[PDB]
Symmetry: C3
Subunit: 154 residues, 3 copies
């Protein structure tokens, strides 16, 4: 009976927590984050080389963005559009040229290459083994040593 009073009080605390949490997720993601399913993408609003971006995302507790669907890709395109800066994705063809994989090593389940890309031609930058996403959502292979918007996936 007293136990009953305790779980009804827990129900009220839990529901208030859920309400307040729904609100603070929306507050937190405004404006530099987007949620898709269980994933959250968030930009730090600065640019780094691919290598430094990788360290930054891991150190923060996440990883670089691996868009596995149109919906996830659109969310990233929304972030780079707002920031007006193209962002590095997680994927590279470093192990095998022309074959872009996630950092786990599996092949892409989704791809949105711009016309003509990937082309592995960064001019004076040499080969292009990383991937940038444009405001329109399209992808281009870019040299990993370039500076691009950092977006992390959590």
């Amino acid at each position: 009976t007293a136990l009953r009073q305790q779980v009804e009080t827990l129900q009220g605390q839990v529901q208030r927590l859920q309400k307040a949490f729904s609100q603070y997720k929306k507050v937190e993601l405004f404006p530099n984050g987007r949620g898709v399913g269980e994933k959250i993408f968030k930009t730090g609003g600065f640019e780094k080389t691919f290598q430094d971006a990788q360290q930054v995302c891991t150190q923060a507790g996440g990883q670089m963005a691996s868009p596995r669907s149109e919906t996830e890709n659109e969310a990233l395109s929304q972030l780079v559009t707002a920031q007006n800066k193209a962002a590095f994705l997680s994927m590279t063809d470093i192990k095998t040229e022309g074959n872009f994989t996630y950092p786990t090593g599996e092949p892409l389940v989704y791809a949105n290459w711009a016309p003509g890309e990937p082309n592995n031609n960064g001019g004076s930058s040499g080969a292009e083994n990383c991937v940038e996403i444009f405001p329109n959502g399209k992808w281009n292979d870019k040299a990993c040593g370039e500076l691009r918007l950092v977006i992390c996936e959590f």
Copy 2:
């Protein structure tokens, strides 16, 4: 009895959640957010026309700021003061000139017009049917096509 052990464990988890949540609300609102009652105002730190600001706030899961009291208005004034940029509020007199309403269509329950305002005179901008808030908290009717600080209400 075992059930008793389970709710006492729930009590501990709930309380730790409440403690950590109180802290992460303060962390999140620092420095671009303010809480007042059940409302949270947060600025994105960029400027947009009223129309674009409306889309941005809705898309993010909220709406534009509708200050219904002195306390809510002060919180907004704190945000525009920090950003040093005047912000659009939610209210317009688009439906009826001189009669400012919330987006629901109800009349203001609170108003803080600067001296002489509203005046519906944006010079070359034409009529003024939206509302900007100044660092001092005072209001001026401004053309909706101007760019002003975006603050959203959640």
Copy 3:
């Protein structure tokens, strides 16, 4: 029995809350925050005098940073490194020259003074009674009237 169903449902809600909360802490701290133990440090990304920084942190619900260990100090150094701007710490020697204390008045349990510091010589700024932290983590006594990165502790 029905009570049993209610606490098992609470267990599921609590665990989902804990999972989502772990994720939104990491999202929130990226990139301007760091957690150490029960503390969270977060920079606002602007500069203020020591006096104004104190007001800002208190008003936000926290206080200025009081690094009490190497780990806490490193977290601050990570924030000023990212921002490329030295930050004020909480400690002053205002009450007694050469004796730096926390705002509670207790002496430092940890210190990381740069070589030669503290020296109480701000040139035209006069005496130096506050403390700045550099990107390398080292400390220098600086005049309290200077503008430095604002980091708050929550």
